[PDB]
């Protein structure tokens, strides 16, 4: 009873926001009455919210002992183990919770989340439906289920699903509860830009709440560049310095910074994964700091501020591994969103978003909480010229002239061709063509027999399907291949005599309208196939059913497995045209396809994520590939598939311009980034708050 009043007082001080007093009071309750299940479960929750997970675990363990029918404690303990990255442990706890109380909606949803996060979507879908059976009104489960359905392209009752999602978010924003739609997913559903920004802002506020309990004073920021010898100190903060799309885009940038005017600090939020991507950034940044070793956001922010950072760059936003608390602490006078996160942070602690006029026209500044800071062409960049230089040139084997049926690439391809007698050079640089003779038969025999490699005139000729067996580092893009590689339509079951439209994105980017658009295109172009990826495989049968319902025979759509990085980029050369997803474009994936010289058709929308491909195309200098509406998207796609002379001209433009335009020019990109940084700095140095930098 006294222990009861103590627990009550603790709860009060907790609600007040005074967590230390709350803890003191819960402990007093335990001191008075040690076997108090509720005091333990309450103190555990509090500790868990403070990020004191090991300590919270002690108390969850007490609660479950004392009250063996306490399903809530098992479930909550499960959440804590999940946060500790004990995946089996958490599952064990959710499993016990459901055994103790089969009617426990939350525990099913939490179990569903383990299945989801483990990639097992159908079991995830099963457990969420059970949750929703038990508790019809359950925003977390409904929205998480909606995302699972998105991942596998299950579009049952799609329109009503989309309406309910919107209604759920409207109600949560109104009732001031954290929305159940994750900000990184909000571009997928027809939410207003206002709602999308508001969701983001709610997540920003979570970070502020977390750091407010540190009771840290604001940091004193440098007011000039004197202590840094006239250099601007730029800090890049990322959990993705390693094998991840982010590094595949920007790994060359730190080492291209001009050391006379910039001092580059890379703050890693992840441990070293042993890959060359991490080696490169560690070797080329002026300073590399492993914040994965500094879990306290207060101590980590202190570290950033001690380094004297002028501009701190958020490369995560609301993506895995983020520590936006670091930015909420504002250790630097200017903080900018860049590259990793395709939307607004919605957060007051972020000053700028680095974007461009095509991605983020000034008209839509309202979609962002940040001021817009424009790069002069696109904000997008990719490391393709450095990672995949063997794809700068190609040769083909004429096996009957097609540029995308049987393709060769290699650092030493010229030397190989030179050892060959009857090579013809078709003018476009140029495309060498090898005749269907002895050497060409040996190549196709390799492919047909599944052989890994052969030797011709002393040159190593590799089967492009076998790169992991030849050099695994070349396969992942960590090293440039040192053999000549053969890529062919037959390797993938693609028709030798038809137009191939590709899209190599994860399937969640496709929606019913998009597939209908694609079906309309295929119907208009008799000799054509759509080439997609099992991304994931369990999406394949859903896409096929919807396609069949649209009157497309099974053989109009060809699926390939997801491939190692190098093979993925290289096999884009086999396609005629890429059909970009309007809901959420290819981003990294768009750069990948363009590096192969493959025209991409796009229809830019209103969200940042729906406009990236058009920005890439605009930089590339291919305005004709950007559609203003669905009819133009279809007409563009069909013209490319049927006017073969036009197709040749467009592919030729792409092929040349991926080099001559700024799109893949990392040095030029870095220099333009530097100009932008200096604009930001001079603006702040003159005593101004952030304003749009739209030159």
């Amino acid at each position: 009873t006294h222990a009861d009043s103590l627990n009550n007082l603790a709860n009060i001080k907790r609600e007040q926001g005074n967590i230390e007093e709350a803890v003191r009071l819960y402990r007093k309750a335990l001191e008075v009455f040690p076997e108090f299940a509720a005091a333990h479960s309450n103190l555990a929750s509090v500790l868990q919210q403070q990020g004191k997970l090991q300590e919270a675990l002690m108390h969850y363990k007490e609660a479950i002992r004392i009250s063996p029918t306490f399903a809530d404690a098992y479930s909550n303990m499960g959440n804590t183990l999940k946060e500790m990255q004990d995946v089996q442990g958490a599952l064990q706890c959710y499993t016990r919770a459901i055994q103790i109380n089969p009617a426990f909606a939350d525990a099913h949803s939490n179990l569903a989340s383990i299945h989801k996060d483990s990639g097992n979507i159908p079991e995830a879908i099963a457990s969420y439906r059970t949750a929703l059976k038990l508790k019809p009104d359950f925003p977390d489960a409904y929205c998480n289920l909606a995302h699972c359905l998105q991942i596998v392209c299950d579009w049952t009752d799609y329109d009503e699903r989309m309406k309910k999602l919107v209604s759920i978010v409207a109600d949560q924003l109104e009732k001031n509860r954290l929305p159940s739609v994750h900000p990184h997913h909000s571009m997928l559903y027809p939410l207003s830009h206002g709602f999308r920004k508001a969701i983001a802002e709610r997540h920003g506020n979570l970070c502020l709440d977390k750091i407010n309990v540190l009771h840290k004073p604001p940091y004193e920021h440098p007011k000039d560049l004197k202590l840094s010898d006239g250099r601007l100190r730029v800090g890049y903060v990322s959990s993705d310095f390693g094998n991840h799309p982010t590094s595949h885009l920007m790994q060359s940038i730190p080492g291209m910074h001009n050391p006379d005017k910039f001092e580059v600090f890379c703050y890693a939020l992840s441990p070293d994964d042993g890959t060359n991507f991490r080696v490169k950034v560690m070797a080329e940044a002026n300073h590399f700091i492993d914040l994965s070793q500094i879990p306290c956001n207060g101590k980590a922010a202190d570290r950033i501020h001690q380094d004297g950072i002028h501009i701190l760059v958020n490369m995560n936003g609301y993506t895995k591994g983020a520590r936006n608390e670091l930015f909420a602490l504002r250790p630097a006078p200017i903080q900018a969103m860049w590259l990793g996160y395709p939307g607004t942070s919605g957060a007051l602690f972020m000053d700028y978003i680095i974007t461009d006029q095509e991605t983020s026209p000034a008209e839509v500044a309202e979609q962002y909480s940040e001021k817009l800071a424009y790069m002069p062409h696109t904000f997008f960049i990719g490391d393709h010229a450095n990672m995949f230089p063997h794809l700068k040139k190609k040769a083909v084997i004429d096996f009957k002239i097609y540029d995308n049926r049987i393709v060769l690439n290699g650092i030493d391809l010229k030397a190989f061709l030179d050892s060959l007698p009857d090579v013809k050079i078709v003018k476009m640089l140029n495309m060498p063509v090898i005749p269907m003779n002895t050497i060409a038969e040996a190549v196709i025999e390799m492919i047909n027999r599944g052989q890994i490699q052969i030797t011709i005139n002393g040159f190593s000729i590799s089967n492009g399907l076998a790169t992991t067996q030849i050099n695994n580092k070349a396969a992942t893009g960590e090293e440039v291949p040192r053999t000549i590689i053969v890529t062919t339509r037959s390797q993938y079951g693609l028709p030798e005599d038809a137009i191939v439209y590709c899209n190599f994105n994860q399937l969640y980017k496709i929606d019913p309208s998009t597939l209908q658009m694609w079906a309309n295109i295929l119907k208009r172009v008799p000799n054509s196939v759509l080439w997609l990826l099992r991304f994931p495989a369990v999406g394949e049968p859903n896409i096929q059913q919807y396609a069949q319902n649209m009157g497309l025979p099974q053989n109009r759509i060809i699926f390939s497995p997801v491939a190692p990085k190098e093979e993925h980029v290289r096999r884009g050369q086999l396609a005629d045209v890429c059909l970009d997803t309007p809901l959420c474009n290819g981003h990294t994936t768009g750069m990948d396809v363009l590096w192969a010289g493959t025209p991409m058709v796009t229809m830019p929308g209103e969200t940042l994520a729906s406009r990236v491909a058009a920005s890439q195309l605009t930089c590339l200098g291919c305005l004709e590939l950007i559609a203003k509406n669905r009819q133009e998207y279809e007409d563009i796609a069909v013209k490319l598939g049927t006017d073969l002379e036009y197709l040749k001209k467009v592919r030729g433009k792409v092929w040349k311009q991926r080099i001559s335009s700024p799109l893949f020019n990392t040095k030029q990109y870095t220099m333009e980034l530097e100009r932008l940084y200096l604009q930001m700095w001079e603006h702040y140095a003159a005593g101004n708050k952030p304003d749009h930098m739209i030159k």
Binding site: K82, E83, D117, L178, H182, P183, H184, H185, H203, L206, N243, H244, P245, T246, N316, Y318, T319, K320, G321, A322, G340, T468, A475, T476, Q506, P561, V562, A563, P564, K565, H587, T588
Partner: peptide, 14 residues
Amino acid sequence: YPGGSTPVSSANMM
């Protein structure tokens, strides 16, 4: 990819 891994951009937990 099957037999290896293909990292992608993804949402942080909430």
